[PDB]
Amino acid sequence: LLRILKETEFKKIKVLGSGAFGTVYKGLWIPEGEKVKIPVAIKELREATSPKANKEILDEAYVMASVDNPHVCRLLGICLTSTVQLITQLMPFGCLLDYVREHKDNIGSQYLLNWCVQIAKGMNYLEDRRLVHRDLAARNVLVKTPQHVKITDFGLKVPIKWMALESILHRIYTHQSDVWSYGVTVWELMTFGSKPYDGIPASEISSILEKGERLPQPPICTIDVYMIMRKCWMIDADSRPKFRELIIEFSKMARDPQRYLVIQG
């Protein structure tokens, strides 16, 4: 259920954006035997990170091409050349981070709280599949429509400001560390794409954490919301909430958004 592509079957057409893992293109799939060309999204990765062999790269692709959840972006094809190219269904909206920045203060409670639930449902799917994301951030949550988001790049500098303490201290990555990152993601959303710890150098993040300081309460959040975010940042991984609890809690809040998020509008 993963299409291995030959450069002859597709073609990048325009650059749509660039980040750390690589560049995003609008592309076209040329089905052989036909006169049409089908739009696709191609993500060309920045290689040379630890020069891996292709069969070792495909082993992984096959797993990401195996996900089935409405809130998890699935790998559809892969083209292994000089560079590694990931193909998926093209969406018109790109990442949640930019989306929320573009709609800075004109986004409503219902939307925020729903993205929170959707992100948790996606994360809970991955947990059930025994997959650890490692870099869950709003930049990694794609928008299919403004009411339907999909998490991407599970298993792909170090996002210190998104990492749980143990990942920082020991490079320990678990579903519980994904919970931490999830709380940061929620925080980005609630602040409309603000940079976590604006100003503080990464080098100093372990110490402020250790000393018990946490990301500040977003002005739009009530204490119940902030309380949840904060629970995601406990030092003791096992005392952090589970994604299934998170789905439930946010589901409840989304049932009466205006009560849990205070936005002028």
Q: Which two tokens stand for residue 159?
A: 């996002």
178: nearest Cα among 109, 240, 104: 240
**Identified binder of ligand ITI from the candidate list 114, 124, 152, 191, rule CB under 6 A:** 152
Angle between helices 243-254 and 175-190 (to 10 degrees): 30
- Residues in the chain, how many? 265
142 is in an annotated binding site: no
Q: Which two tokens stand for residue 4?
A: 């291995």
90 is in an annotated binding site: no
Contact track, ligand ITI, 51-90, x by CB under 6 A: -------------x--------x-x----------x-x-x
Q: Considering only residues 11-50, where is the footprint of ligand ITI by CB under 6 A?
A: 16-17, 19, 24, 41, 43
Q: Is 238 in the active site? A: no
**Identified binder of ligand ITI from the candidate list 155, 169, 198, 224, rule CB under 6 A:** 155
49 is in an annotated binding site: no
Q: How many positions of this chain bind ligand ITI (CB under 6 A)?
A: 24
18 is in an annotated binding site: yes
C-alpha distances in Å from residue 44, one per residue of 24, 162, 205, 229: 6, 24, 31, 33
43 is in an annotated binding site: yes
8 Å CB contact between 44 and 25? yes
Q: Which residues contact residue 129 at a Cβ distance below 8 angstroms, ignoring those fewer than 6 apart? A: 66, 67
SS3 229: helix
As separate numbers, helices (DSSP H) first and strands (DSSP E) second, the chain gives 9, 8
8 Å CB contact between 186 and 229? yes
8 Å CB contact between 72 and 122? yes
C-alpha distances in Å from residue 14, one per residue of 46, 80, 81, 82: 17, 20, 19, 19
* Shortest reach from residue 93's CB to ligand ITI, in Å: 5
How many whole angstroms separate alpha carbon 191 and alpha carbon 171?
Answer: 28
* Shortest reach from residue 98's CB to ligand ITI, in Å: 6
Q: Which residues contact residue 45 at a Cβ distance below 8 angstroms, ignoring those fewer than 6 apart? A: 21, 22, 83, 84, 85, 86
Cβ-based nearer residue to ligand ITI, 153 or 249: 153
Q: Considering only residues 206-245, where is the footprint of ligand ITI by CB under 6 A?
A: none
Cβ-based nearer residue to ligand ITI, 18 or 258: 18
Cβ-based nearer residue to ligand ITI, 65 or 229: 65
Residue of 98, 105, 135, 256 with catalytic role: 135
What sign results for the dihedral spanned by CA atoms 50, 55, 59, 61? positive
Cβ-based nearer residue to ligand ITI, 19 or 146: 19
Contact track, ligand ITI, 88-117, x by CB under 6 A: x-xxxxxx--x-------------------
* Shortest reach from residue 80's CB to ligand ITI, in Å: 13
Q: Does 133 bind ligand ITI (CB under 6 A)?
A: no
What residues act catalytically? 135
Q: Return binding residues for ATP.
A: 16-24, 43, 88-89, 153
The site for ligand ITI (CB under 6 A) is made up of: 16-17, 19, 24, 41, 43, 64, 73, 75, 86, 88, 90-95, 98, 142, 152-156
